[PDB]
Symmetry: D2
Subunit: 358 residues, 4 copies
């Protein structure tokens, strides 16, 4: 009957994101999915730092936070295990001992500079009490473009989901997925590879099966949102929680079990094109983080994507203690850091050996 000439971009099937950065996004994804390597999450907020300087009793100052990063970044040879570093806004503008800004320092060593672009958690104000959303989309492109000029080529945004009474509200499931999807699009348009982090928190008395159920439910909606917004699959990365029992459940899971549940959930929700999955440690111990990732890279279940790490706590705990916040502790701190980095590097390769942590 009646025909009409429309713009191809107005047709539902042609919603895939169009950006001149596509080629570079794929290249960054390539470097970020290097065998035997993972990411160092060093984007702790000024408030989280206070928590970090505790078992070592160090004051929370701008200078000490810079030394906190310098401890791990200026550690000779770390680029052997780390392919990218998620920096905090403050650290982006700080300089290493050699005078290079941290992004320049990383870029010179072949390490991709990354940046946490979200603006923190806030009450969801919908759904159930205790649920939270993430702010930061207003003025996003402006901020991202500036970070890109400073050398950053990838970013990270975190949304959280709190399991309560074995479930999570649909308000949270829908809203946080839309937030993550929009974030992915604005990032790619700004030239930064987006690390989409939908963390189903370990907090709670739930068992591994509950975590498995909620994680699958939360993750598949993130995927649906991403398809709605037309993300470039070849140009993004996922940063999920591992499927493990709750922190206050009193139950433990064998590495084989975590790998089974974690890998099964991912495969059941993620498109096979997803380039990589960089696990957050989120509450697991340094050894758990390594053992689990290792068992995950030994799973017989389908996992076409790169499975590695994007650890903060699981790579810093020991390094911080041995360092003690003192110069004389750098050598020991750096030794502690590289060891954890090496263990996780081998875990990525499925050759982790627990005896090495004995």
């Amino acid at each position: 009957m009646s025909r009409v000439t429309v713009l191809q971009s107005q047709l539902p099937a042609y919603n895939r994101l169009k950006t001149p950065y596509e080629s570079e996004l794929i290249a960054t994804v390539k470097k970020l999915t290097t065998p035997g390597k993972g990411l160092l999450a060093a984007d702790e907020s000024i408030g989280s730092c206070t928590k970090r300087f505790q078992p070592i009793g160090l004051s929370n100052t701008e200078e000490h936070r810079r030394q906190y990063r310098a401890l791990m970044l200026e550690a000779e040879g770390f680029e052997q295990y780390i392919s990218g570093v998620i920096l905090h806004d403050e650290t982006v503008g700080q300089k290493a001992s050699n005078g290079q800004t941290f992004p320049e320092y990383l870029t010179a060593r072949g390490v991709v500079p990354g940046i946490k672009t979200d603006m923190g958690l806030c009450p969801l104000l919908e759904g159930a009490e205790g649920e939270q959303m993430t702010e930061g989309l207003d003025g996003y492109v402006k901020r991202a473009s500036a970070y890109y000029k400073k050398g950053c080529r990838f970013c990270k945004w975190r949304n959280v989901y709190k399991i309560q009474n074995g479930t999570v509200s649909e308000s949270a499931v829908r809203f946080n997925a839309e937030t993550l999807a929009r974030y992915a699009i604005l990032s790619q348009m700004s030239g930064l590879v987006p690390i989409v982090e939908p963390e189903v928190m370990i907090d709670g008395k739930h068992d591994i099966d509950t975590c498995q159920r909620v994680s699958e439910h939360v993750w598949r909606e993130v995927v649906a949102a991403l398809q709605r917004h037309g993300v470039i699959w070849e140009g993004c990365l996922l940063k999920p929680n591992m499927v493990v029992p709750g922190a206050e459940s009193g139950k433990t899971a064998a590495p084989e079990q975590v790998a089974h549940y974690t890998v099964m959930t991912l495969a059941r929700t993620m498109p096979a094109m997803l380039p990589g999955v960089m696990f957050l440690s989120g509450g697991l111990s340094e050894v758990q983080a390594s053992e689990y990732l290792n068992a995950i890279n030994n799973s017989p279940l389908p996992r076409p994507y790169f499975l590695s790490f994007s650890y903060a706590r699981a790579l810093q705990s020991s390094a911080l203690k041995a360092w003690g916040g003192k110069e004389s502790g750098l050598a020991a701190g750096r030794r502690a850091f590289l060891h954890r980095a090496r263990m996780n590097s081998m875990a990525q390769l499925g050759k982790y050996k627990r005896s090495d942590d004995d």
Copy 2:
């Protein structure tokens, strides 16, 4: 088989927003939906004021903008036709000649103080070129609660939809609907009655049927998004465009036709509980804005909601001309305003008489 104890608030059917401000939001809606009254939209941005100040060749200063606003906010007797005023952020802080801030000034005169809370249009960056989204959800509650303290009781947020090639992208239909829905929730939680404004623009060569189809499509997704975010229907208002032919279509619709198409489109998409629809003028001439509203209020079609106006251009055009800027044309300015406000007050009641309106009115489209 297995049973589990969950919070009622975690179940899909219990997503309705819970706020202690509910009673107050409803009360405000009542005032905002008073027979024979509409809203004055004086929320033009600082930049937009440069577009209002061109014809009269006025200096775009903070003092002048205050006069621009005071020109009509102080015009005695206007509260007989205006039940609420949408103020710009800067005007909320300015004072009237009496020393009271406009919010305080308006309240004492019975006129509810409102505030435009959105942060402007930006490129959608999804869908088709030319489409735009609206920012402002970050730190919203913090801004809204502050406005509340200053006396504001309702807010306004505007999203736009550009008809191109007889259609709009779904990226735009979905995203702007979600933005508007979230906006409504945060406003109600902050104590401000939200005026949801999904404007399908008159820009383009599209005819009235194309505007009808697009408006229906856009509006229903806004309603769907509102249902998912659980808005309190009894406490919000809609500010839509009227369904009319495009500005460059070469055609002009008769009042009866615009009434039919507009009232029909609202009925097919809006829940019967929606307390009120406050039309934007969107480029129509001052007379058309009055003529069409009057016809709308004489439509035999279903319309349980209060139908009125929330005009900016269709209420300030001539009153601005007569004013010119000097306090000399103040009487002439406040005279042209009260007349336009009276014509629309009559329209709300469906008693508008074209014979009482100037026999000459040019489009306010740009």
Copy 3:
């Protein structure tokens, strides 16, 4: 940059159903929304007749069912209170005393003939145990077209929702809404005004508030599905449950409360264009059905749509008892029927007086 010529019907905003029957569908709606009139639901299945015939000692035969329908359809005077009658597939082909098929007989006497087109409830096989879906869409156009030929001008389809533990599953909320919307579209395309019936059953121990919550949640999705399918709003009717406490709640609700909750729920979910809402009695007594409808038509809440009845049990109970299935009880049964039809007629007008029912 790139344009494409497509069919206007391929665009999302142009999904409204196109049918040459539109004008007739609206004309039918007008007759079914006539002040002081309602619908008689006489579409009981063979199995339901058993439940109606058992308590009066009447054998369930093809002949006794016809006599069961004749009892009401030939109660001269009922046309004054009944604008339409929902017939069972069997009755459509039966004949009244004068040799006319019931549809012909009804049409000749000013009543619009309708037909129940759904094929029964079945286990949902998704969501929670006890939930059911409704079959009937396969070959629907063929059946509906045959009905139109015989004189039917509107139809009815029933889906049910069972409140369990104060909630219902999304699987049911979504699936049944999609079933109803598809059914509405196919009915209109066939020239039959569709009566959409999403019955939130009174069964259970829930209070009126829970019914309100579930009814609003169920209603809204039915509407959403109708919008996605592009139904002609000016050509359909809703046949919902009134909002009242559960049948096993041991709680009673005053007429004014039912009216407030019911009218408020419709207003919050139904587009103002919906032409009419014909309530099902669903377990309420004959008196509650009249009392509640009467209060609904006296409610100060918004209600652009016509509010009337589409009752089965609430119009048949007393009549079946007085009739006793005996030709010698016809006069008594018909007086009871007319009385009940009369009470609901005055209820539609908001002039029902409880004293009239003693």
Copy 4:
């Protein structure tokens, strides 16, 4: 603030279909995903046999149809290439030359019996003219459980999408996806592994890119519908079209381009858990079907799922011609058939040699 005890099955996150047939379903997938083996699509309807017997002039009779399928089913040694066969309704009840039903015959021969359970295409009656939906969900569990009792362990259901003007309507995209997902669920509940077939037809002037876009769009929705209905991913299979230019586009794609586009589209839409993808020949020639599958199994792109075949035409065409419907032609026919079977078997392994195959294969598109 208040709590409530509900069934776990009432919560959104717990919607995975639960069936006692899960184990057997997965076991069945394992059989249907055996390296070097594919499926034989012999579910042609009586009306579809009319056009297949047209060439060799064979009367469409229950008997002639029985032999037509026996030709391939009783082809000695075909089990080395075929893991399962999709039968038509009547063939399920017909008998092999040894007196036992084909299902019993195939089972004893290590082959899995399958049944096509859809009731055919019908006008969509929504969206655009030319679009079709598929009927068959009414009384499904009853029919399916009947087939299961007769030996069947998997089924097939086909929905089609027609590219027109470079696109398809959302009405079709949504409705056909929901139909497939409900079909999948009812199938698993009846103990049958469902092969979900969303065919974006090769018909049209469109190029490979338009087919890619449309296929991506259509398939992701099927996936969305499957997640909403809670399908058991570990127990189902997908049967899509390959991404190739239209039959009337005038262009023909090189094996490796088809591989790139097809695999890329699958990876962007399908969850990594999806057991396998059994392609349809959809009109391609016998050799094209084999070449493309070979190139597909040689793609460097991510593809965790078993990629194989489930052809009807591309496997029967020449074998049928050789048979001629004559008894003396059974040998000639079964050689051609077992040949094509071997070719696709190699293609499944990415070890297909174009040399070892015919030199000229005509289009099977009508």
